[PDB]
């Protein structure tokens, strides 16, 4: 079909976030059988393999931003691979890794579709700049390299000379915000980005939130949707094996509802599954719940509705 024509891109990258172990991001999501669980329903799954990320030895940090050149080279290599798999007319399923890859994962998507809209499901806004950060981790700064309105408030970070800001402030939607910096909230209220924090999700309910989200992005003109999904945006009772978990998150029901309503538009054109960290589960059962949750989110992005699916032939024979 037009949708559920997946090109999987692994990206085992960890040098944006401190908790080392998300390098087993694509390894664990593939050994849980994401490919085989996609291949029952009509999914033309083509694995493009994990990317080879080199190890730059003299990775001298910025003022607070640390490991800048490795993240810049990793996102440039990823953006090249995403532009390759979107010239094949597929849906760029990227799965890492950490949110530092989403710079390339949205830039390479915007090399083909310049009018995309990002549904950034995350506990955090990830909209810190290299000037307003406190951690300096680049899993907290992917959005501020991508917004067109933040051109000029971004210093020339080494390794990010290729990054062209590709989306505007009114073309991105946050769902699930519950841990926002003061600098992040000031940027989020200055630019006027439509965000659905957990206050609005508790108020309106996930049905009204997804209805207003799809009306905000797709109400004016049908355009590609790039769901960049984080696994700490869901509640840590469902995904405890993530990098920066924040309690009081989206329930597993509500996450599956978000992905089902994105699928029923039929305009999904890129999926990002970041911050899966299998080395942080206190039991292997916690890792099992995290990975089964992320796999179920991806499968509900690509057609598996909870009400059931049937192939269009008669079964009473």
């Amino acid at each position, epitope marked *: 079909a037009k949708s559920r024509t997946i090109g999987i891109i692994g990206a085992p990258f*960890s*040098k944006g976030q*401190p*908790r*080392g*172990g998300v*390098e087993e991001g694509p390894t664990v999501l593939r050994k849980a059988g994401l490919l085989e669980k996609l291949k029952e329903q009509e999914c033309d799954v083509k694995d493009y393999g994990d990317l080879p990320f080199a*190890d730059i*030895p003299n*990775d001298s940090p910025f003022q*607070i931003v*640390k490991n800048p050149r490795s993240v810049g080279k990793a996102s440039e290599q990823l953006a090249g691979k995403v532009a390759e798999v979107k010239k094949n007319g597929r849906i760029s399923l990227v799965l890492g890794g950490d949110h530092s890859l989403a710079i390339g994962s949205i830039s390479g998507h915007a090399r083909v579709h310049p009018d995309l809209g990002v549904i950034w499901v995350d*506990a*955090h806004t990830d909209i810190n700049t290299p000037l307003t950060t*406190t*951690s*300096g*981790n680049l899993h*907290g700064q992917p959005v501020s390299f991508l917004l067109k309105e933040l051109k000029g408030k971004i210093p020339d970070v080494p390794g990010f000379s290729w990054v062209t800001p590709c989306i505007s402030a009114k073309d991105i939607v946050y769902i699930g915000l519950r*841990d926002v*910096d003061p600098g992040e909230h000031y940027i989020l209220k200055t630019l006027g980005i439509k965000y659905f924090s957990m206050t609005e999700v508790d108020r309106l309910g996930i049905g009204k939130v997804m209805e207003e989200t799809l009306s905000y992005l797709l109400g004016r003109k049908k355009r590609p949707i790039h769901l960049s999904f984080d696994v700490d945006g869901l509640d840590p009772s469902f995904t405890p094996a993530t*990098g*920066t978990p*924040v*309690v009081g998150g989206l329930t597993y029901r509500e996450g599956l509802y978000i992905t089902e309503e994105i699928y029923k538009t039929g305009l999904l054109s890129g999926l990002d599954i970041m911050e899966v960290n299998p*080395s*942080l589960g*206190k039991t292997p059962e916690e890792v099992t719940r995290t990975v089964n949750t992320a796999v179920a989110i991806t499968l509900a992005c690509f057609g598996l509705a909870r009400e059931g699916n049937h192939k269009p032939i008669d079964y009473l024979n």
Partner: antibody
Amino acid sequence: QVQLVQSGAEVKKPGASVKVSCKASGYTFTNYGISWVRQAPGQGLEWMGWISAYNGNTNYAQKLQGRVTMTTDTSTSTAYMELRSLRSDDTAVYYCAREGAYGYRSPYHNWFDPWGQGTLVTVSS
Amino acid sequence: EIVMTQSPATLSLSPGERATLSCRASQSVSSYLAWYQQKPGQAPRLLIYDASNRATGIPARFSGSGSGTDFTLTISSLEPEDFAVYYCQQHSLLPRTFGGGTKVEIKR
């Protein structure tokens, strides 16, 4: 400066625990995370637990799950480490040091740089 | 759980030239490990925080390298106050093992 004052040299037979205060001063607490590391004399060192003072994150290690409990007192910035079912193999100098909290706002830290002066704990009857 | 192995178990080098050490990992810690200076009866003082960069009060001579499996610690200007057991610590994998011990003796 950036310190960790500990207290104190305590001897417990196999019985009740050796809850050690690890008082932090100089740096902003609830912006980092204190971990603990043991050292038997004439041996190596073993990491044995790490609390984040941001939000109470236990995250213990293998072989003592179980035996250790670790809390904070962040009105006055100390951090505690109790024990359970004490044993004569736990004759060590219990150091506390700071990993840094791995939240979202807490800064980059991976390397134990406040170090406390250690605590003489010999467990005998 | 990653065993961190140090290839000089002991070491005896007179006050003088370089005393380059070793810390081999069992996986790819990838430029995320540290170095220490536990003197006998003291707290382990930090030497190197992430494979280089000389952490905040080190005199002139304790540079190291890595990235990402077998690391080095160079003591270029040996300085006989430095006769202490050195420990390497991986950090970006849990649980957080240390090295074994690198007892730099005196060489007569």
